[PDB]
Amino acid sequence: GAMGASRLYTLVLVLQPQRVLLGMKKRGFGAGRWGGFGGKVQEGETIEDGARRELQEESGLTVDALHKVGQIVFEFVGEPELMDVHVFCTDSIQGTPVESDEMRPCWFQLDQIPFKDMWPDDSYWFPLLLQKKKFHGYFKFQGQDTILDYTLREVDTV
Numbered sequence: 001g002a003m004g005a006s007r008l009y010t011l012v013l014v015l016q017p018q019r020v021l022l023g024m025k026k027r028g029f030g031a032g033r034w035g036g037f038g039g040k041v042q043e044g045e046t047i048e049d050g051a052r053r054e055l056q057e058e059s060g061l062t063v064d065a066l067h068k069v070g071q072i073v074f075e076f077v078g079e080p081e082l083m084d085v086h087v088f089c090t091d092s093i094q095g096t097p098v099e100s101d102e103m104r105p106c107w108f109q110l111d112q113i114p115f116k117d118m119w120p121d122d123s124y125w126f127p128l129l130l131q132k133k134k135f136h137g138y139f140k141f142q143g144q145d146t147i148l149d150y151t152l153r154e155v156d157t158v
């Protein structure tokens with residue numbers, strides 16, 4: 001039948017030549033994992049404005065200019081609504097990251113990407129992000145650890 005309805009999310013990676021900024025989620029769904037900064041797009045908000053807003057709210061960083069790098073759809077067994085995540089990256093920042101109620105930030109060298117403490121799907125698409133290759137992906141999860149199905153492709157245009 002019809003593909004499930006999806007909720008629009010953004011996800012932002014601050015990716016510099018030698019390091020990436022990640023936030024450890026302090027509470028809720030996915031708590032205890034390092035990831036990018038993101039959340040739900042609000043009514044009337046452009047996707048990129050939502051991405052900038054999520055970065056500011058969760059990390060304190062203000063950036064003008066994000067680059068679209070990928071789209072990932074997440075599905076969780078037992079929940080009919082999908083997560084439609086638009087992924088962005090920026091290399092140029094001009095402030096300091098701060099701990100927020102949602103996220104605790106640390107910088108990671110790019111030979112120390114903390115995959116063991118990141119969502120399992122990141123092992124597949126994060127390498128494409130690091131190579132500056134655009135991608136579309138889909139991951140079906142049983143709970144937070146187990147992938148039952150996934151698709152992934154490199155694209156020329158997101």
Ligand SMILES: Nc1nccc(-c2ccccc2)n1
Nearest residue numbers: 007029074076079081082083
């Ligand atoms: N906590 C939780 N657990 C399972 C699924 C979801 C979900 C959220 C937004 C959109 C689609 C699914 N959220």
Ligand SMILES: Nc1nccc(-c2ccccc2)n1
Nearest residue numbers: 025029030035074119121122
């Ligand atoms: N990379 C990835 N994979 C699956 C789910 C998530 C997620 C993280 C925080 C909040 C909601 C979903 N992130």
